[PDB]
Design a binder for this molecule. Structure first.
Ligand SMILES: [Mg+2]
Ligand SMILES: [Mg+2]
Ligand SMILES: [Mg+2]
Ligand SMILES: [Mg+2]
Ligand SMILES: [Mg+2]
Ligand SMILES: [Mg+2]
Ligand SMILES: [Mg+2]
Ligand SMILES: [Mg+2]
Ligand SMILES: [Mg+2]
Ligand SMILES: [Mg+2]
Ligand SMILES: [Mg+2]
Ligand SMILES: [Mg+2]
Ligand SMILES: [Mg+2]
Ligand SMILES: [Mg+2]
Ligand SMILES: [Mg+2]
Ligand SMILES: [Mg+2]
Ligand SMILES: [Mg+2]
Ligand SMILES: [Mg+2]
Ligand SMILES: [Mg+2]
Ligand SMILES: [Mg+2]
Ligand SMILES: [Mg+2]
Ligand SMILES: [Mg+2]
Ligand SMILES: [Mg+2]
Ligand SMILES: [Mg+2]
Ligand SMILES: [Mg+2]
Ligand SMILES: [Mg+2]
Ligand SMILES: [Mg+2]
Ligand SMILES: [Mg+2]
Ligand SMILES: [Mg+2]
Ligand SMILES: [Mg+2]
Ligand SMILES: [Mg+2]
Ligand SMILES: [Mg+2]
Ligand SMILES: [Mg+2]
Ligand SMILES: [Mg+2]
Ligand SMILES: [Mg+2]
Ligand SMILES: [Mg+2]
Lengths: 155, 188, 260, 131, 167
RNA sequence: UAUCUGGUUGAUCCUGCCAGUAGUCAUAUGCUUGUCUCAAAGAUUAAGCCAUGCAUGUCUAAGUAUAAGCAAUUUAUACAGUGAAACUGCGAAUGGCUCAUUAAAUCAGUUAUCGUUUAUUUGAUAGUUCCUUUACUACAUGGUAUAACUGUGGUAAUUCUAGAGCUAAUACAUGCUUAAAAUCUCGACCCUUUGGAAGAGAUGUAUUUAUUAGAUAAAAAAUCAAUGUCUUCGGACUCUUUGAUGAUUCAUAAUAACUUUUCGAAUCGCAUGGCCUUGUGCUGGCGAUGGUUCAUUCAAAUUUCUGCCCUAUCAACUUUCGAUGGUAGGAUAGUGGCCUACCAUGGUUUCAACGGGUAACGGGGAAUAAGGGUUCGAUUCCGGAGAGGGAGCCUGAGAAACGGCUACCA
RNA sequence: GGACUUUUACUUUGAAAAAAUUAGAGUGUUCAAAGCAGGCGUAUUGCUCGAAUAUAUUAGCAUGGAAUAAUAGAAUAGGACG
RNA sequence: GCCCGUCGCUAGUACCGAUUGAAUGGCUUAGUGAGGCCUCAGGAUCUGGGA
């Protein structure tokens, strides 16, 4: 989520060991590192064009993506730089030979390279433990908004 | 012993979780080195599987490196002047990683003038060559030159003294330096 | 729970050993070594349960403490020492040389080999890395370290190994149509060439195998042990050549051979 | 900590305890083959029952199905082996038939009598159990 | 019968925690410590016994003390300890300066000396020769493999440059 | 292996339950009990309490022998056989037992470590150690202080131990060493160029920090700052070197330094041989124990996805005193609100949160046989938890250990 | 190797997969419950077949299918291909 | 003929109920706080700033 200020903490936000020599007069001020997480996920330009710092970003930060790759729909965006998705699924009861609707809510970190709204289907990649509960990271937005601009005024 | 299990601590629902098993050692924690300044005192602590961790308590020298100058010297550590985590660390001059310290400058002076032939602030054959070789490269930087006058340089502890018994850092440069300077004075 | 386990309940024992249900309670716990637990055959089980040479285990120490038996050339005197796939057991008395190479059912077989083929082994390299001071090394499925190997050598390739000295004298790249021995899963001990591999980035490449009976089957890559060119194995295969017949097919072969 | 010694029982008992007809039926058999127990009849009909079961379960699988052919043949070759199943009816819809006395007619008890040598189903017993 | 313990002060008893390497306690197990009663190191009339050691000899001899003298039981066993109980320099050669304790079998009187350790001998020197031997030999041997691989790679390069000129 | 029967009425057909019937690796109890084989067994109630004995110790040619021990013989005047005691080393963290707690916990199947530790077994791996660097540092090998033992003692009492006198090391604590080469910084002198130099030091591995390399997505150019190699002196640079992964700041390497400086054999058993300038010179055989880093193996620790019995006479729950997230740190083997600062206001819930109950350890499985089901699993295997209850910790590679210690409670 | 890809349910075959238990093949423990043995000769100097197969579902992985049932698409064109 | 309730006897079960009733178990406020561990000191002694 981040937005504005970027240098808004008590500590200086920077990328580890990405020294920029001040002697060397340069036109871009800050040298910035990045990668592609692989598995086929484009490292969106807003990660390379970005100036945010998030060490928990899978493109600009020091996290690796491995283990389960999951999709689920976004249902909470109130946590600064993280969200809560719901993954629905039917569950088979034998004896009755039918299923029942179930769900779980997975908490997952979301880098300022994505701009996620409630309702967006999102794909996340499993993580090293990143917080008390978050074990996933938003790796791609599948959605958009859900035709919001096609909710405008009158003729 | 301090335990770092998650088995206490409510679950995301807010549930209270019954105690399953007694504390294990392998999930242990220990108390902070809260390392201070002056006169070497280091206590080695025996960690999991052989392995020593070195607890610093009191330290006066540390190895500090001017990055854009490509060198490292070991200076006295003058004191702690800003800490992003806690002010009691600054007030009580506690050395931890990320602490901003002041160091000594006169090793970073002795080297500079002996490598550039310029002197900050304000006759050999080969040296004259070398000194004249360098420059267009001696041009330092305003807010780092001005610090040598004072005799003290701003530098961020970059190691973990409570772990390695080393209190090591880098001189504050460019962006970073400006940052902490802005903080330093708009609170001074 | 508190430290390394040091016992093995007979029943937890691996089943391709063919230990019997009664007559005890424990089975020999395979020592730490070059082969993993659940894919090994401990000296005690070979000298006694296969070769029938010893009667007790107590006799197996007596046999061994005479430095009679030696694995891959070195002597070895550990009643339970983990012997395993591709290794070379040798009884110096009796002139006998063996190789540990899998059945079809999936078990280790008593397979006699020549006095000269017993002087080298095959090893699947399990990784290759850059070591300290820039020296590159390969590591085989039996935990051998070999400094300075061929640049063309990469992970999954098998490798001929001296035994006498340490070195590699040849390798075989993992290419479509190369002789494969299957080391794991239910298709364990079958043999068959390679059709092609399924990629699957981020876990478990499959390898499509076909034997010399135009039969097909799949295992996880890790379960594939390269061992030559179609026809040409670089080691003598046991009888039955790892083909696997139907229960019906097998019954017939067994009940066709009957006229005393 | 030892392996379980496995075991099973070998007989099963009539659902209805007092069926006058099944009782007459049973007693006769005993009298014919020199049995002492109604259990010795229970045992066999229990053997028969399970055999019939496997015979059922097989004959619902397709004709010329692998398991059906393997295990089905096997079943017959065992039955013929002891002389319960007729050489003619060698295809297990008559194992599905079958019946108790076909099993009874083959015990040592009986054979020792059937071909002379005892001249009484009881003498037959007495002789055997006396080495 | 509780013992005293140097430097508790106090003229009473207390219950200290004791460890490896300390008075009035013998650990039964590695890192074992046991809580035990201890008598103070200040003499009261509650003591059963004073233990004392003479430092200066008074004007008169005491019977079983100054009059009688008891030999030290064992003599120097490690090399340079002999060389210092007799003061010898690394010249004199121990072997004949070792102590020698006679003893009798009844009609066979015997002779038994220690077993000098840290004695420099041919056998030791042969192992010192072997160590320095192996280190160098391995070092050279290892250098050759280095160069042999450096060749494999040098004449693999001129194989991607006769292949890059073939086409 | 798809069956029913007795009981409501005067009789009738229903509904419906009660009774009969059969099995139970399902416990008891009663009567009766001859033969072979097989063999469960203080789970249930009281994870209640326990007399006594036992259940953990251990030595190879090869760490330590002046036993004032035995044996004597067979060469051993340092030692040499055998060997108590004791030192040192390893083990006691396995095993055995039990099912108290435990309901998203454990457990299962399936994942993750690019998030760590790992005695051992197996495979590799160390020419660098000193010093202002000709009158040198033990390397033909440096230091004591201790058991056992001897002797003097103390207490009713224990695997209590004190004062005195000895003596070992693979215990303790020290401390030398070795080829050539190249590269780096310094630079005494000389001379003006385009510039070059004798010789001085530094450079094992580990540790800590900062900096750089670690390319590759198809191809080319100009210019600034430094500055590499070859002159056919305007100038060119031509061959130009690259590991793995789906992915990394990876493996590995380079620079400036940092360290109460990790490791780099003061160890042991067998044989005794070459080789001349005849020094007991210089060499040298098989293999034990060790030793750093790497790998491997035995492991461990966390960890993804999904799955639990009854309960709403439990509807809201979670942030006192962390509840959900961000930043920094500290702590740890290491990730992580694990803990602390600061900041924010979040997290869960009728798809049942939270709470309660369980005469709840979870699985592999057991009992019942048309099928669908229903009931059960303390208990031979795997996982987990515990050692009267709690907490704490020493040792150690591994324990929050109980046939270890410390404390409180009983 | 680059550049991008509407989401699902179902079903198929398959990989990964502890043993003991269960189903079940082979074998005459004298029979049997069992067990995993055993069987052949030159029974004076060894020959030899075994120690199968099946079930293993819910979840996860891999692959074939495109019916049935969901989903998203282009209407203020902010459309689609160049 | 059947049949309803008060009332009366015997026995049994459960309910309400003064006793601000009793007991066991699990969590827990506040107060007091053992002990080991870390840490500031200390220095019986015993050597070369350390133990
Ligand atoms: Mg927030
Ligand atoms: Mg073992
Ligand atoms: Mg993988
Ligand atoms: Mg010695
Ligand atoms: Mg009636
Ligand atoms: Mg009636
Ligand atoms: Mg009437
Ligand atoms: Mg009933
Ligand atoms: Mg009990
Ligand atoms: Mg029991
Ligand atoms: Mg002796
Ligand atoms: Mg255990
Ligand atoms: Mg001392
Ligand atoms: Mg040592
Ligand atoms: Mg480049
Ligand atoms: Mg590369
Ligand atoms: Mg690195
Ligand atoms: Mg000689
Ligand atoms: Mg209630
Ligand atoms: Mg945080
Ligand atoms: Mg709130
Ligand atoms: Mg409900
Ligand atoms: Mg319970
Ligand atoms: Mg159970
Ligand atoms: Mg249960
Ligand atoms: Mg119970
Ligand atoms: Mg425990
Ligand atoms: Mg008890
Ligand atoms: Mg408590
Ligand atoms: Mg305990
Ligand atoms: Mg006990
Ligand atoms: Mg125990
Ligand atoms: Mg399937
Ligand atoms: Mg089988
Ligand atoms: Mg009261
Ligand atoms: Mg503290």
């Amino acid at each position: 989520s981040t937005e504005l200020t970027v240098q808004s903490e008590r500590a200086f936000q920077k990328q580890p060991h990405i020294f920029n020599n001040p002697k060397v007069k340069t036109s871009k001020r800050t040298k910035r590192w990045y990668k592609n997480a692989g598995l086929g996920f484009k490292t969106p330009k807003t990660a390379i064009e970005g100036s945010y710092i998030d060490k928990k970003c899978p493109f600009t930060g020091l996290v690796s993506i491995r283990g389960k790759i999951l999709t689920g729909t976004v249902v909470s965006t109130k946590m600064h730089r993280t969200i809560v998705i719901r993954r629905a699924y039917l569950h088979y009861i034998p004896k009755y030979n039918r299923y029942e609707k179930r769900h779980k809510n997975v908490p997952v970190h979301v880098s300022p390279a994505f701009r996620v709204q409630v309702g967006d289907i999102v794909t996340v990649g499993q993580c090293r433990p990143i917080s008390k509960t978050v074990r996933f990271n938003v790796v791609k937005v599948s959605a958009a908004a859900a035709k919001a601009n096609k909710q405008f005024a009158k003729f | 012993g301090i335990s770092r299990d998650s088995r206490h601590k409510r679950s995301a629902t807010g549930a209270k979780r019954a105690q399953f098993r007694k504390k294990r050692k392998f999930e242990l924690g220990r108390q902070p080195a809260n390392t201070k300044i002056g006169a070497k005192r280091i206590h080695s602590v025996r960690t999991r599987g052989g392995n020593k961790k070195y607890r610093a308590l009191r330290i006066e020298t540390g190895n500090f490196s001017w990055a854009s100058e490509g060198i490292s010297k070991k200076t006295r550590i003058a004191g702690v002047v800003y800490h992003p985590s806690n002010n009691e660390l600054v007030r009580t001059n506690t050395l931890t990683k990320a602490a901003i310290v002041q160091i000594d400058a006169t090793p970073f002076r002795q080297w500079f003038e002996a490598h550039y032939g310029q002197t900050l602030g304000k006759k050999s054959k080969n040296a004259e060559r070398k000194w004249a070789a360098r420059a267009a490269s001696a041009k330092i930087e305003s807010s780092v030159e001005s610090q040598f006058s004072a005799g003290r340089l701003y530098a961020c502890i970059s190691s973990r003294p409570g772990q390695s018994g080393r209190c090591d850092g880098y001189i504050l440069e460019g962006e970073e330096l400006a940052f902490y300077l802005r903080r330093l004075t708009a609170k001074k | 729970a508190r430290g390394p386990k040091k016992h093995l309940k007979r029943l937890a024992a691996p089943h391709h050993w063919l230990l019997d249900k009664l007559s005890g309670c424990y089975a020999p716990r395979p020592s730490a070594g070059p082969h993993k637990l659940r894919e090994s055959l401990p000296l005690i089980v070979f000298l006694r349960n296969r070769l029938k040479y010893a009667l007790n285990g107590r006799e197996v120490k007596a046999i061994l403490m005479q430095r009679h038996v030696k694995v891959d050339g070195k002597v070895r005197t550990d009643t339970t020492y983990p012997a395993g796939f591709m290794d070379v057991i040798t009884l110096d008395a009796t002139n006998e040389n063996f190789r540990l190479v899998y059945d079809v059912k999936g078990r280790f077989a008593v397979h006699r080999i020549t006095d000269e083929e017993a002087s080298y082994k095959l090893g699947k390299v399990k990784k290759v890395q850059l070591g300290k001071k820039g020296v590159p090394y390969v590591v085989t499925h039996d935990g051998r370290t070999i400094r300075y190997p061929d640049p063309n050598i990469k992970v999954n390739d098998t490798v001929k190994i001296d035994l006498a000295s340490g070195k590699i004298t040849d390798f075989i790249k993992f290419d479509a149509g190369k002789l494969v021995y299957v080391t794991g899963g239910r298709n364990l001990g079958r043999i068959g060439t390679i059709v092609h591999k399924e990629r699957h980035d981020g876990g478990f490449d499959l390898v499509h195998i076909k034997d010399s009976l135009d039969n097909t089957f799949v295992t996880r890559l890790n379960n594939v042990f390269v061992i030559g060119e179609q026809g040409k194995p670089y080691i003598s295969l046991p009888k039955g050549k790892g083909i696997k017949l139907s229960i019906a097919e097998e019954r017939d072969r067994r009940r066709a051979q009957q006229g005393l | 900590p030892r392996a379980p010694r496995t075991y099973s029982k070998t007989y099963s008992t009539p659902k209805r305890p007092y069926e006058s007809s099944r009782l007459d039926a049973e007693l006769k058999l005993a009298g014919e083959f020199g049995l002492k127990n109604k259990k010795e009849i229970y045992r066999i009909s229990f053997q028969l029952s399970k055999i019939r079961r496997a015979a059922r379960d097989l004959l619902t699988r397709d004709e010329k199905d692998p398991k059906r052919l393997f295990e089905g043949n096997a079943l017959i070759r065992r039955l013929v082996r002891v002389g319960v199943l007729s050489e003619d009816k060698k295809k297990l819809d008559y194992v599905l038939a079958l019946k108790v006395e076909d099993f009874l007619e083959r015990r040592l008890q009986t054979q020792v009598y059937k071909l002379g040598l005892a001249k009484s189903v009881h003498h037959a017993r007495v002789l055997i159990t006396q080495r | 019968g509780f013992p005293m313990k140097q430097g508790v002060l106090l003229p009473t008893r207390i219950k200290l925690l004791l460890t490896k390497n300390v008075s009035c306690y013998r650990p039964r197990r590695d890192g074992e410590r046991k809580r035990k009663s201890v008598r103070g190191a200040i003499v009261g009339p509650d003591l059963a016994v004073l233990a004392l050691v003479i430092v200066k000899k008074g004007e008169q001899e005491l019977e079983g003390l100054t009059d009688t003298t008891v030999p030290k039981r064992l003599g120097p066993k490690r090399a340079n300890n002999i060389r210092k109980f007799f003061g010898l320099s690394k010249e004199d050669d121990v072997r004949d300066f070792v102590i020698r304790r006679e003893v009798t079998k009844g009609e066979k009187t015997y002779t038994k000396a220690p077993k000098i350790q840290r004695l420099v001998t041919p056998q030791r020197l042969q192992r010192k020769r072997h160590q320095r031997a192996l280190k160098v030999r391995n070092a050279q041997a290892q250098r050759e493999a280095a160069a042999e691989y450096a060749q494999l790679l040098a004449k693999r390069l001129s194989e991607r440059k006769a292949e890059k000129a073939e086409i």
